[PDB]
Design an enzyme around this catalytic site. Sequence first.
Site, PDB file in Angstrom:
ATOM      1  CG  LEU J  42     112.421  12.365  -6.880  1.00 22.10           C
ATOM      2  CD1 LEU J  42     113.710  12.763  -7.577  1.00 22.10           C
ATOM      3  CD2 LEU J  42     111.224  12.760  -7.716  1.00 22.10           C
ATOM      4  CG  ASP J  43     107.906   7.370  -6.525  1.00 28.57           C
ATOM      5  OD1 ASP J  43     108.162   7.419  -5.304  1.00 28.57           O
ATOM      6  OD2 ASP J  43     106.823   7.757  -7.010  1.00 28.57           O
TER       7      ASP J  43
END
Lengths: 459, 11, 176, 63, 102, 125, 156, 114, 78, 88, 96
Positions: J42-43
């Site tokens: 994920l970011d």
Amino acid sequence: MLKIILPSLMLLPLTWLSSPKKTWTNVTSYSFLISLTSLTLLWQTDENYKNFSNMFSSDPLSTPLIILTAWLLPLMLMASQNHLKKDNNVLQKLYISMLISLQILLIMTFSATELIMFYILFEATLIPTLIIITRWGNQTERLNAGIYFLFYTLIGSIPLLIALILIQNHVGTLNLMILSFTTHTLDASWSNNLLWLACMMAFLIKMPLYGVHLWLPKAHVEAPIAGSMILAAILLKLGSYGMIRISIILDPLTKYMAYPFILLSLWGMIMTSSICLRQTDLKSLIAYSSVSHMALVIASIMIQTPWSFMGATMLMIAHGLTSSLLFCLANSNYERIHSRTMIMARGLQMVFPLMATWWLMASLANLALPPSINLMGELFITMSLFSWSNFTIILMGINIIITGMYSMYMIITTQRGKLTNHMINLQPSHTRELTLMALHMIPLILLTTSPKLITGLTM
Amino acid sequence: RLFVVKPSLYY
Amino acid sequence: AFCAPPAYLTHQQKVLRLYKRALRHLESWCIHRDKYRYFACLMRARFEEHKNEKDMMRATQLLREAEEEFWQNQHPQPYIFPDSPGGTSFERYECYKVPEWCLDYWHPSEKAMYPDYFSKREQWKKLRMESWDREVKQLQEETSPDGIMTEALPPARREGDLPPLWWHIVTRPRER
Amino acid sequence: HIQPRYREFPQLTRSQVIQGEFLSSLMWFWILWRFWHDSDAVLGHFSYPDPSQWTDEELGIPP
Amino acid sequence: MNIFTTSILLIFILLLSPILISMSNLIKHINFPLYTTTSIKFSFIISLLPLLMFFHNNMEYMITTWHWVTMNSMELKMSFKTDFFSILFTSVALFVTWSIMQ
Amino acid sequence: KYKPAPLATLPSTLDPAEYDVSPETRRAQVERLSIRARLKREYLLQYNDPKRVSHIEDPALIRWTYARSANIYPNFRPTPKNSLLGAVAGFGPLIFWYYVFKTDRDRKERLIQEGKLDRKFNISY
Amino acid sequence: HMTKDMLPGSYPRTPEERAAAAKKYNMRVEDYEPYPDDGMGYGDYPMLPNRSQHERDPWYQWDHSELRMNWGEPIHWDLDMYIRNRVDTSPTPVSWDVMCKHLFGFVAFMVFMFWVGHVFPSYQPVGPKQYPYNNLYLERGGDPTKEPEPVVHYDI
Amino acid sequence: AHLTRRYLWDASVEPDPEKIPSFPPDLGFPERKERVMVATQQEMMDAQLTLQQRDYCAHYLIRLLKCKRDSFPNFLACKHEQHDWDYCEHLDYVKRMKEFERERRLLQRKKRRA
Amino acid sequence: GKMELPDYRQWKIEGTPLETVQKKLAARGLRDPWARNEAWRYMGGFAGNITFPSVILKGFKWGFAAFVVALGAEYFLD
Amino acid sequence: SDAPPLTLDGIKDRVLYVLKLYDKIDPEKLSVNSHFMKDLGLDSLDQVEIIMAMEDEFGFEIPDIDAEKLMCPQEIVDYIADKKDVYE
Amino acid sequence: SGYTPDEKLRLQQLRELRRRWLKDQELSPREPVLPYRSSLFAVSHVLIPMWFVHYYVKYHMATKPYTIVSSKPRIFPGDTILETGEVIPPMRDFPD
Ligand SMILES: CCCCCCCCCCCCCCCCCC(=O)OC[C@H](COP(=O)(O)OCCN)OC(=O)CCCCCCCCCCCCCCCCC
Ligand SMILES: CCCCCCCCCCCCCCCCCC(=O)OC[C@H](COP(=O)(O)OCCN)OC(=O)CCCCCCCCCCCCCCCCC
């Protein structure tokens, strides 16, 4: 009166040849009995005043000062007890003797009839105060404080003596009520103007005028608690008594030789109530409060009206009690934290939930919460000055606002935040100091219920 | 049920 | 409320915090969840449009302009959760958050009840006068002699040693 | 007493709903009773005569 | 003129009573909230009567209760002016503070 | 655009001092943080330290009180604008109020002397 | 206990003095800046930003929390007015110059319009009210023995 | 309305609310009768009325207060009386409006006389 | 007491304004990964549109009914 | 009306619930330690959104300095437990 | 960057210590150790005060001249006063 003075004189041997364990107890109990006996003076069934001798006398104005003086003593005994606790038995007996001598001399100078006896006693009040402030203070500027106090007082008092001699020569006596039944009008000349200045400056200094208030904050901040109490309660009242007694002969000069002092009082009121907003020392804050309150007394004596004198007396007694109470309240903390800085300790009312009430009521009084004698005095001073001139109400309202501000400031920066949790040395509240605060308050309730004993000469 | 910390209040 | 800021925030942290504040003010402006989701997706598109860029100067410029746009389009009465600064409960129970040392002054007839409680409080001290000296050495010995220092703290590397400077993070009062 | 519910519409007692319905019905009964018997107080009971509809005989004005 | 004044001062006696139990040692052995609420309830029930007698007669009263001071042609005393405003506001405020205490 | 003021200050976002990456900036920040952390470690070696019966002192608070209270006169120097501020603040308002009150009193007195006033019910003063 | 070498002093006129002053106040000799020499008692006391204590971080676990200020940190000469129960310098979305203008405009326009409505009032088309006994001359104070200037109220 | 007709149109040919009885009363009324008073000063003073209230309708107000003090526990039994008082006050208002219109018509007479 | 959590296999975008928002975000070329969370409302006991009439005319039914009842009783009693 | 206290298993349930509702990456396979970047990729922006959803779920704020360090449901549960003073 | 391992261990230790402080702040049972209504309330909180108040009024507030000064009661035509056996006559014919 002698039944009040002789036992006060006997409290000394009692103190010295009492054992090192029962001297405090015995002298305090007997001081309370003296306070009790002093109420004979309140048996005034007629408008005639009391005269026990050629040397003594009592009035509706000197009786309350005398009873407050005889009442404050055991309170000072109790309050000077935690400190100088380790100090030697001899030293603490010396302290007690100083207190008792102050009591006796103040009673004498309130019950006096002759201005020169009043003078020698109002100037003998210096030795014990100076000794208490210099021998039992904790800082290194108590010496300079005593210098300031002593010498302000003496510089103000010399010309008063000279004026008293001039009078004793022109007239043949300095006796009161004779100086009244024989007083004459004056010529409004410069010699008599300087006579006025002389008679007045001593008292205008002993109750701090705005410009010569530079001995009270020192003395308070540097003095112990009993010295602070007596200075705030009675030594600031000697001037008021003296002026109320000496202004009868200076007519009709005070109609125009009083403007400067009315101005200085009404302005320094504001200019000290404002310092009470940005001072860091709690003791100096309360000192400037005393100053801003005595300014009203000064301005009310200056205008010479019955309502004015009534308010002056009421506020005198009320401020005495309230200032003593506030000083003892700050002392309770000092004994625990050894710092007069207000913002240091905060968030109390959590561990001291009751003393936060005494803190609150002493503030409700200082900001003149009705029904109270602080207000029954302020209101009548305001009305008298409004009759004098309607533009005084402006400065009166400004002072009222600033008082309501700094009282609650003093409350909130000590009792109404969140705690300095790093304070391990907060010994719980002593029964002794709770009793101090109760003995300060309850008489205010009783004098608010029966303020007929507190109006004064006029009423 | 838990314990509520409080000062003395006895004095 | 558990760590300390670093000597300086990095561009990443700045941009992340700007994104969070922008989304909170978008929530404030848009009262309904559908609208909030719509415009949050729009804003994240606006953001991602410049994620694979690396020119630091142009990045800082875009950030300096976006912060001004935020100051110009910010809700002046945003939503603050109650127990958080500006909220209607921030510092509300500090009146009842009384510390622990306030029990050393209790009176025997007060700890006479809760006796099983105060027995534990005792040995919690025995666990403190012993665990103190070694908590200092672990700091003395773990000191950076090159001058550098920050507000961090290490754990204990032993069986029996305890984290240095624990007594105040432990023992603190409930929030309630 | 009650059982908390998660992401659902909770169980509803009968008192808290019947009492609200009763209060509302009473308010509307009052509104209706009043608007029936004392309608004037919101509409009017004393007309406002048209100025200049009088006669110069009254409010006498000589020619 | 005995029922009116008695009913006027009784509400004050009642309102005072709780604060008297607040200084006593009964707080820790009483349900102070319920007791105070019942005091307010009975104070309202009492204040209801003067309202009836006024609505009937439209009579206002002045009641001087105690001499506080006499300051040289200026007396001060506890003086209650029971009029329309006072007797109605008392009932309203009591009826409200009841609900508020609960 | 936001015009800063001494009472509505400029935020940290719009402060170009922030976003500055010069070493003369980041090094200074690191040194400031090191000082802050040294002081916090010193203070926490006293807060949680057992065998402590007393409280903690604040030399900074002591310095602040001493400066605001007693270090004033030793550094006071009479200067222009200083003597002037003092003289004005001290005397000006007194003169203003003196003339206000004196005008009012004189007017009232001449009115009363002429009898042109209404003092109905005034029997207290 | 403290000492004259730990307490403040007079204006530094050398870096030999600025160094000791800043190391005493616990700042760095660059960020340290004393007050100008206008003979006002300040002396060598730090001159710090005129920012309040609202600006600071609420989420940090300070030492003095109500003041939001650490232990040895140098204290602002004007803390008593920034203690967070008092003056707030924290920024505002709207700007001083425009908010003052908007408030002054609202107030002054409303005042001017009060005066406009006073010059041009509103009323209803009726004559003054009529009270029989000479506008109630007797009841309305009057004097019994004397007589009033009689006035009449006619029909229609 | 009169507001416009005065503040925008001719402001000198429209009356002024404070100078309504200005002109002589009988300039168009021969033997103009007086407004009668069927309530006595004593009958109105022993009832403890108010000086904004003891006007030409104090008799119906007296009946209202009477029928109210009586039948008291049952309010709402003073409607037929309240109606009478409201009506007399409405008729007084009508007389005032007609005085206003009279004076405006006389202003018309004065502006048409030249 | 032990709390329960219903299955997440029922909170679906279908049949709600979240679906229209999805239509719009697709027209623009985007997706919403959170709509299924906000979709716990908008369906179930929380479903349906409430109206200002709905809140103001509450009770009106039985209010009017009892009003007419009392009116008839009044006409009877004369 | 007082709401019930919290439990560690309850916080676990709620966190894993929100993360299951999440769609961008999480294929409904989330163990307590499903790291966002390593295990799920994920970011940081997605992490911001995740923390904000946790806040909107529990009713309080996570300071950004401390939210920039949460990358595991277990870390989230631990922070929330430290904040709410659970498991007396 | 998440919690460094030293921070993680620090937090785990502080956690296992706090979850023990709280379990200890819990307390056992059997501690803290310790050693009609309408009518009775009516009586003891209304009657007694009412008796005292009636006494005070009747014998210290009506014995004095101007302590209880009622306004005058409205009188209307036909109201026959009782302190003099008097009757005031009605009003005039009402035009209508
Ligand atoms: C830091 C402050 C300064 C400290 C140093 C003080 C320096 C002292 C001043 C130097 C000496 C100047 C005074 C000389 C006194 C002159 C005599 C005099 O003024 O007396 C006149 C008046 C009596 O005159 P009269 O009764 O009318 O008839 C003729 C006499 N049978 O009787 C009187 O009026 C008595 C006058 C006594 C002197 C009064 C001094 C001024 C009073 C106001 C200020 C007081 C404060 C201390 C002095 C401040 C500086 C003046
Ligand atoms: C047509 C008419 C239209 C015009 C009508 C004009 C009417 C007159 C208006 C006068 C009133 C204006 C002056 C009022 C001062 C109010 C000061 C104040 O608000 O103090 C509280 C303030 C914090 O309050 P706040 O800003 O709301 O912060 C909330 C954060 N969440 O910050 C503080 O805590 C400060 C605490 C007190 C500081 C000391 C104050 C000293 C006294 C100065 C004020 C009095 C000056 C006289 C005011 C005029 C009356 C003569």
